[PDB]
Amino acid sequence: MGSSTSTSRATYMDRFNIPKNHVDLIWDKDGTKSHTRGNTTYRWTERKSNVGVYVGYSEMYDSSAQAYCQSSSAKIDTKTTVGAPYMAAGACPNYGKVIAFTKRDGSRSDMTRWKNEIHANVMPHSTTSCASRADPGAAEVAKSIEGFAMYAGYLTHCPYNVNVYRQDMVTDKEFDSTVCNFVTESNPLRFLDTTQQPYTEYAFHGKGGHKGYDYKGQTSHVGCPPYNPPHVTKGMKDSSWITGPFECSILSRCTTHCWPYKSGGNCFRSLPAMFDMSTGECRLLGYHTQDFRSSTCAELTTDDTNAFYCVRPMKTAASSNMVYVTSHTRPDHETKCPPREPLKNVRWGVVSKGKYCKPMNARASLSNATAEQCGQRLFMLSSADGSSLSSQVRGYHWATFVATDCNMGESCAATARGKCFFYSTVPECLIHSPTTMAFTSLSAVDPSIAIDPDSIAVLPEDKCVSVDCGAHGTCDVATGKCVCEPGFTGERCDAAALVP
């Protein structure tokens, strides 16, 4: 009732305001932003808004005692690929977004390759106690089949000892013992479970079955050369609390100090992750890079351990179970970010005359496309950080697909063709239509999983936009035609209605 309805509608529609809410956040107990999710209150600082959706980056932030990952001697993968020490950034989960291995032009895309572990020349880290020694990289999956997945684990458990927890972790201003209660000295995250070969194999992340580095080696001395990669990974000992993409980001937040580092080598912090909505698998990625297409990028396979592969972010209907999650995902994303599913049978709009809705102004349109196609192109035209992708993106974060003669809530939605409309305007309301579907740049692109929005967002269309009925009539918003006073007639009620 009254003005509260407009306020309630705006609060709901806020979740689609991507430039405003897809922010670069850091965890900070002195932060001005806060939110209680369940029993836990999170505190954070918003350094910047409008983080790139297609590719999102911010300056690497290291608030640990040693701050190794902000050191000039620390290698960050984006230094090479992007030209600066960037961490993957973007507060909203990006549904459907997968890092695909491609050729330099983007063709021959592989969208499952990422599941293979990285080859960053890290493992083995030390072989001091071994009979023989080996260089970092010797235990890792061959470069020729390198993926983007972080190493399955490191050492028996994290924190490996008292000093690690008390010096490296508890002093880190982004670390919190309550949020990270699954990786503490009293409750360590186990890779090789010695409390139950004199142990049971698990992992810091993932559910198992992936090609990873040979953590064991052939000898009875675990971790010593020689190695026989790839080793098939196992899953986490306890993954039950990871119930969604935000919980998956917590795993990343809390496991930074579980990884090795030495001067000149890769420094791992604030890692992005892939969450699988269907299985609940949370997989950490070892690289912050999201796009690489320069002339020096490697195409699909190489032996050169110093090169970086060609990759592009991609979305397909089949990838709609996957979620690209940054370490700094906002805990209020359900109300501040778009949902996974597209919106069936609605059109993006802005408010007109207080309680009606008019369609937004299309900045561009694509003819004879599918719904999947429309969502895919929206993503590509959204936004991007880095210095080179500005030529591709346009700032489009919302799209309306209009089927030629299919109801997009039905089975025909999958194959239906029609016209895609792209917008740069922040939507304020929705208009119902049988033949339409609404996408955002953060949405999955499978039209068959589309859902209804909350009805609070849906208003009747203002069909009386630019209709002047004169002094003897008023435009009926239900029909978009003038209703004339008695004794008057005509389309604009300016002719006298004569009687026989």
Instruction: Confirm if 157 and 192 have CB atoms less than 8 A apart.
Output: yes
Q: Which pair of structure tokens corresponds to residue 6?
A: 């407009």
Please state whether the peptide bond connecting residue 85 to the residue before it is cis, i.e. omega within 30 degrees of 0: no
Question: CA-CA distance, 14 to 18, in Å (whole number)?
Answer: 9
Question: CA-CA distance, 248 to 257, in Å (whole number)?
Answer: 17
Q: Which pair of structure tokens corresponds to residue 341?
A: 């599913």
Secondary structure percentages of the chain, helix, strand, coil, to 5: 15, 25, 55
Query: Could you give the 3-state DSSP secondary structure of residue 267?
Result: coil
Question: CA-CA distance, 417 to 421, in Å (whole number)?
Answer: 13
Query: Could you give the 3-state DSSP secondary structure of residue 336?
Result: helix
Q: Which pair of structure tokens corresponds to residue 397?
A: 């974060």
**Which has the closest alpha carbon to 290: 21, 78, 75?**
78
Neighbours of 465 (CB within 10 A): 14
Q: Which pair of structure tokens corresponds to residue 247?
A: 């919980």
Instruction: Confirm if 493 and 473 have CB atoms less than 8 A apart.
Output: yes
What burial class does residue 484 get, using C-beta atoms within 10 Å of its C-beta: 0-12 exposed, 13-18 middle, 19+ buried? Answer: buried
Q: Which pair of structure tokens corresponds to residue 427?
A: 């939507």
What burial class does residue 348 get, using C-beta atoms within 10 Å of its C-beta: 0-12 exposed, 13-18 middle, 19+ buried? Answer: buried
Question: CA-CA distance, 374 to 391, in Å (whole number)?
Answer: 19
Instruction: Confirm if 236 and 202 have CB atoms less than 8 A apart.
Output: yes
**Which has the closest alpha carbon to 228: 148, 300, 134?**
134
> What b/e sequence results for 261-278 when a residue is b if at least 16 CB atoms lie within 10 Å of its CB, and e otherwise?
beeebbbbbbbbbbbebe
Instruction: Confirm if 290 and 94 have CB atoms less than 8 A apart.
Output: no
Question: CA-CA distance, 383 to 251, in Å (whole number)?
Answer: 27
Residues after which the chain is broken (C–N above 2.5 A) are: 196
The total number of residues shown for the chain amounts to 500
Which helix H or strand E contains 399, and what residues bound it? strand 398-403
What burial class does residue 196 get, using C-beta atoms within 10 Å of its C-beta: 0-12 exposed, 13-18 middle, 19+ buried? Answer: exposed
Please state whether the peptide bond connecting residue 124 to the residue before it is cis, i.e. omega within 30 degrees of 0: yes
**Which has the closest alpha carbon to 426: 32, 49, 48, 90?**
49
DSSP structural state of residue 54 = S
What burial class does residue 304 get, using C-beta atoms within 10 Å of its C-beta: 0-12 exposed, 13-18 middle, 19+ buried? Answer: exposed
Strands lying side by side in the sheet with 33-37: 24-27, 40-48, 33-37
Question: CA-CA distance, 66 to 360, in Å (whole number)?
Answer: 50
Name the residue with tokens 């949370």.
282
Beta bridge partner(s), residue 276: 322
Q: Which amino acid would we find at residue 335?
A: T
- Opening angle at CA 384, ends 85 and 438, nearest 5: 145
Q: Cα 361 to the chain's mean position, in Å?
A: 27
Instruction: Confirm if 312 and 106 have CB atoms less than 8 A apart.
Output: yes
**Which has the closest alpha carbon to 311: 38, 84, 77, 494?**
77
> What b/e sequence results for 391-424 when a residue is b if at least 16 CB atoms lie within 10 Å of its CB, and e otherwise?
eebbebbbbbbbbeebbbbeeebeebebbbbbbb
DSSP structural state of residue 477 = T
Question: CA-CA distance, 398 to 343, in Å (whole number)?
Answer: 11
Please name the residues in contact with 337: beta carbons below 8 A apart, sequence gap of 6 or more. 15, 18, 21, 22, 91, 92, 93, 330, 442
CA dihedral 169→171→172→178, nearest 10 degrees, is: 70
Name the residue with tokens 């209703």.
483
Residue by residue, DSSP assigns 165-232 as IIIIITT-TT--TTTTTTSSSSSPEESEETT---SEE--SSSEEEEEE--SS-SSSSTTPSP--SPEE
Residue by residue, DSSP assigns 359-376 as E---SEEEEEEEHHHHHH
HSE-up (13 A, CA, CB side) for residue 242: 31
Which method was it determined by?
A: X-ray
Question: CA-CA distance, 274 to 283, in Å (whole number)?
Answer: 5
**Which has the closest alpha carbon to 408: 397, 423, 419?**
419
Query: Could you give the 3-state DSSP secondary structure of residue 53?
Result: coil
How would you classify the pairing of strands 94-95 and 98-101? unpaired
Name the residue with tokens 């999983």.
449
Which helix H or strand E contains 252, and what residues bound it? helix 245-254
HSE-up (13 A, CA, CB side) for residue 189: 27
